[PDB]
Design an enzyme around this catalytic site. Structure first.
Site, PDB file in Angstrom:
ATOM      1  N   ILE A 112       0.806  -1.216   0.000  1.00 17.69           N
ATOM      2  CA  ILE A 112       0.000   0.000   0.000  1.00 17.69           C
ATOM      3  C   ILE A 112       0.839   1.265   0.000  1.00 17.69           C
ATOM      4  CG2 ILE A 112      -1.762  -1.307   1.222  1.00 17.69           C
ATOM      5  CD1 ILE A 112      -1.250  -0.157   3.657  1.00 17.69           C
ATOM      6  N   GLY A 113       2.133   1.178   0.307  1.00 20.97           N
ATOM      7  CA  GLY A 113       3.013   2.323   0.185  1.00 20.97           C
ATOM      8  C   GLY A 113       4.474   1.970   0.373  1.00 20.97           C
ATOM      9  N   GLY A 153       8.411   4.061   0.620  1.00 21.99           N
ATOM     10  CA  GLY A 153       9.189   5.287   0.576  1.00 21.99           C
ATOM     11  C   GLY A 153      10.261   5.362   1.641  1.00 21.99           C
ATOM     12  N   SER A 154      10.567   6.579   2.095  1.00 18.22           N
ATOM     13  CA  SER A 154      11.595   6.766   3.117  1.00 18.22           C
ATOM     14  C   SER A 154      11.255   6.021   4.404  1.00 18.22           C
ATOM     15  CB  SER A 154      11.774   8.258   3.398  1.00 18.22           C
ATOM     16  OG  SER A 154      10.561   8.805   3.896  1.00 18.22           O
ATOM     17  N   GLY A 171      10.113   3.030   4.543  1.00 17.07           N
ATOM     18  CA  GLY A 171      10.201   1.601   4.317  1.00 17.07           C
ATOM     19  C   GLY A 171       9.099   1.123   3.394  1.00 17.07           C
ATOM     20  N   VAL A 172       8.569  -0.074   3.634  1.00 12.75           N
ATOM     21  CA  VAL A 172       7.433  -0.592   2.877  1.00 12.75           C
ATOM     22  C   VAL A 172       6.313  -0.935   3.849  1.00 12.75           C
ATOM     23  CG1 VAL A 172       6.641  -2.260   1.177  1.00 12.75           C
ATOM     24  CG2 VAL A 172       9.033  -1.510   1.160  1.00 12.75           C
ATOM     25  N   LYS A 211       4.422  -2.970   8.425  1.00  4.25           N
ATOM     26  CA  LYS A 211       5.461  -2.009   8.077  1.00  4.25           C
ATOM     27  C   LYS A 211       6.817  -2.680   8.221  1.00  4.25           C
ATOM     28  CE  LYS A 211       7.278   2.557   9.490  1.00  4.25           C
ATOM     29  NZ  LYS A 211       6.931   3.878  10.111  1.00  4.25           N
ATOM     30  N   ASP A 227       6.731  14.566  13.201  1.00  4.72           N
ATOM     31  CA  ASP A 227       6.416  14.432  11.776  1.00  4.72           C
ATOM     32  C   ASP A 227       4.902  14.466  11.575  1.00  4.72           C
ATOM     33  OD1 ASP A 227       7.032  14.250   9.032  1.00  4.72           O
ATOM     34  OD2 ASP A 227       7.190  12.075   9.042  1.00  4.72           O
TER      35      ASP A 227
HETATM   36  C1  SZW Z   1      -2.048   4.687   4.256  1.00  5.54           C
HETATM   37  N1  SZW Z   1      -1.243   3.986   5.245  1.00  5.54           N
HETATM   38  C2  SZW Z   1      -1.838   2.956   5.982  1.00  5.54           C
HETATM   39  N2  SZW Z   1      -3.005   2.493   5.503  1.00  5.54           N
HETATM   40  C3  SZW Z   1      -3.684   1.633   6.270  1.00  5.54           C
HETATM   41  N3  SZW Z   1      -3.380   1.167   7.483  1.00  5.54           N
HETATM   42  C4  SZW Z   1      -2.203   1.618   7.934  1.00  5.54           C
HETATM   43  N4  SZW Z   1      -1.689   1.289   9.156  1.00  5.54           N
HETATM   44  C5  SZW Z   1      -0.479   1.917   9.313  1.00  5.54           C
HETATM   45  C6  SZW Z   1       0.376   1.913  10.417  1.00  5.54           C
HETATM   46  C7  SZW Z   1       1.531   2.678  10.340  1.00  5.54           C
HETATM   47 CL1  SZW Z   1       2.565   2.795  11.735  1.00  5.54          CL
HETATM   48  C8  SZW Z   1       1.854   3.393   9.200  1.00  5.54           C
HETATM   49  C9  SZW Z   1       0.997   3.396   8.118  1.00  5.54           C
HETATM   50  C10 SZW Z   1      -0.192   2.670   8.163  1.00  5.54           C
HETATM   51  C11 SZW Z   1      -1.343   2.493   7.250  1.00  5.54           C
HETATM   52  C12 SZW Z   1       0.215   4.189   5.173  1.00  5.54           C
HETATM   53  C13 SZW Z   1       0.834   3.895   3.808  1.00  5.54           C
HETATM   54  C14 SZW Z   1       2.345   4.130   3.847  1.00  5.54           C
HETATM   55  C15 SZW Z   1       2.667   5.492   4.441  1.00  5.54           C
HETATM   56  N5  SZW Z   1       2.075   5.639   5.777  1.00  5.54           N
HETATM   57  C16 SZW Z   1       2.559   6.850   6.452  1.00  5.54           C
HETATM   58  C17 SZW Z   1       4.082   6.867   6.604  1.00  5.54           C
HETATM   59  C18 SZW Z   1       4.560   5.778   7.461  1.00  5.54           C
HETATM   60  N6  SZW Z   1       4.902   4.904   8.113  1.00  5.54           N
HETATM   61  C19 SZW Z   1       0.620   5.569   5.668  1.00  5.54           C
END
Ligand code: SZW
EC number: 2.7.11.26
Length: 347
Positions: free
Chosen positions: A27-28, A30-31, A33-34, A50, A146
Site C-alpha cells: 500500500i506504500g 518510501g523513506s 520503508g514498505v 510495516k 512528523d
Molecule cells: C495509508 N497507510 C496505511 N493504511 C492503512 N493502514 C495503515 N496502518 C499503518 C500503520 C503505520 Cl505505523 C503506518 C501506516 C499505516 C497504514 C500508510 C501507507 C504508507 C505510508 N504511511 C505513512 C508513513 C509511514 N509509516 C501511511
C-alpha cells in the site's frame, strides 16, 4: 500465499506467538520503508505490516515507543518480528499494526481537487482527535516530530482518526540536544528552521496548526521550496518575527536580519465563510514563540470543539460520533483540572 511467522505481541505478556496472514499487497513504499496490507488468517481482520531495514546509521525509536502506547487515536501495534529481505545479509523489523482505510491527506484532497473544502464537522472531529493523540504522547515526553496529513489515518464510516508513523519520534529530555532538520518541510516549526536543538513538544502543535489551516484552505498554508524558503513562506503570513520572538525560538540567532513585512490578517488568510472559531484556534497554534502556542489538551478544550461536546451531535451519516471523552489520568496529567471542560456532564 499464506505466510506463517512467530511474532512478539505489541503489548502485554511477552510470550511469542505463531501468526499467519495472507492477501498481502503493497500500500506504500518510501523513506519510511514498505507498508503492506494483509489479512490475518486467524480472525480475518485486515492489518498493515510495516517493514523497515535495520540500519545502524539511521536513528529510529519506533518500536520502543509503540510498545508503550495504548490510545484510541493512535494506531495499535499488534505484533513485531524480524526477517530477512531485500539486502541479502541484513535484518528487517516487521511491525504488524492496525489497518485503517483512509488518510486525512486523501480525504482533504478529495474535496480540495473538487474546489471544495472538508465539511466543518470533520475538521472539528479530525483536529480534536489529533490533539487528543498529541496530549497522550506528550504526557510521556514523546514528541512525534512528523505531524502531517499523510500520517493521519481515518476510518471514513466511524470518523475515527489514528496517528501513525513514529519513525521520527523521540522522548525529549531537557538538556539533551535534538536534531534540527526534522519534520516534513511544510509542517516544520520555525524554531527548527532557526536551528534550535533545545526545542520541545510544541513543534508538534505548530505542525497541527499547519494541518488545521490546510483543512480550512484546501492547500498547505506554508508551501516552502526549501528549508530556507519555508521561513519566507511563514513570514509572508505571520509577518517578520521580532527580535524577542527569535530569542524565544533560538537565542543564538536573534541578530537575524530580514525585511520588515507586516502580518496578513488572519480573517483574510481564509475564505469569508471560514468559521471564525477555527481561525481563532489557528491563530493560537501558528505562533512564533513556542511557549505561546496552546498545549494539545488546551486545544481540545477550545471553543471550536464545543459542538463535539453537545449531547445531540451526530455524524452526517446519522451515526454517533466516535469516543471523544474517555480521558485517562495519564492523558489529563498536564492539566488535570481541565477535565471539567473536556468531559461534558452527559459523559
Ligand atoms: C495509508 N497507510 C496505511 N493504511 C492503512 N493502514 C495503515 N496502518 C499503518 C500503520 C503505520 Cl505505523 C503506518 C501506516 C499505516 C497504514 C500508510 C501507507 C504508507 C505510508 N504511511 C505513512 C508513513 C509511514 N509509516 C501511511
Amino acid at each position: 500465499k499464506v505466510t506463517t511467522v512467530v511474532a512478539t505481541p505489541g503489548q502485554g505478556p511477552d510470550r511469542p506467538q505463531e501468526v499467519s496472514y495472507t492477501d498481502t499487497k503493497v500500500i506504500g513504499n518510501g523513506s519510511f520503508g514498505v507498508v503492506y496490507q494483509a489479512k490475518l488468517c486467524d480472525s480475518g481482520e485486515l492489518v498493515a505490516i510495516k517493514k523497515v531495514l535495520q540500519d545502524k546509521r539511521f536513528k529510529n525509536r519506533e518500536l520502543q515507543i509503540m510498545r508503550k502506547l495504548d490510545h484510541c487515536n493512535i494506531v495499535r501495534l499488534r505484533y513485531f518480528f524480524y526477517s530477512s529481505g531485500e539486502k541479502k545479509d541484513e535484518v528487517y523489523l516487521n511491525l504488524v499494526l492496525d489497518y485503517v482505510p483512509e488518510t486525512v491527506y486523501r480525504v482533504a484532497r478529495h474535496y480540495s481537487r473538487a474546489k471544495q473544502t472538508l465539511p466543518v464537522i470533520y475538521v472539528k472531529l479530525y483536529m480534536y482527535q489529533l490533539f487528543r493523540s498529541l496530549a497522550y504522547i506528550h504526557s510521556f515526553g514523546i514528541c512525534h516530530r512528523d505531524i502531517k496529513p499523510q500520517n493521519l489515518l481515518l476510518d471514513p464510516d466511524t470518523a475515527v482518526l489514528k496517528l501513525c508513523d513514529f519513525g521520527s519520534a523521540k522522548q525529549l529530555v531537557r538538556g539533551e540536544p535534538n536534531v534540527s532538520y526534522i519534520c516534513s518541510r511544510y509542517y516544520r516549526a520555525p524554531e527548527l528552521i532557526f536551528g534550535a536543538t533545545d526545542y520541545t513538544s510544541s513543534i508538534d502543535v505548530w505542525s497541527a496548526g499547519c494541518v488545521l489551516a490546510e483543512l480550512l484552505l484546501g492547500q498547505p498554508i506554508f508551501p516552502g521550496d526549501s528549508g530556507v524558503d519555508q521561513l519566507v513562506e511563514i513570514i509572508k503570513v505571520l509577518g517578520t518575527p521580532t527580535r524577542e520572538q527569535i530569542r524565544e525560538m533560538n537565542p543564538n540567532y536573534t541578530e537575524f536580519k530580514f525585511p520588515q513585512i507586516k502580518a496578513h490578517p488572519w480573517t483574510k488568510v481564509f475564505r469569508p465563510r471560514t468559521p471564525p472559531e477555527a481561525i481563532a484556534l489557528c491563530s493560537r497554534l501558528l505562533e512564533y514563540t513556542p511557549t505561546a502556542r496552546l498545549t494539545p489538551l488546551e486545544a481540545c478544550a477550545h471553543s471550536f470543539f464545543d459542538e463535539l461536546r453537545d449531547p445531540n451531535v451526530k455524524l452526517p451519516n446519522g451515526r454517533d460520533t466516535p469516543a471523544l471523552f474517555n480521558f485517562t489520568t495519564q492523558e489529563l496529567s498536564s492539566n488535570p483540572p481541565l477535565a471539567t471542560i473536556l468531559i461534558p456532564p452527559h459523559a
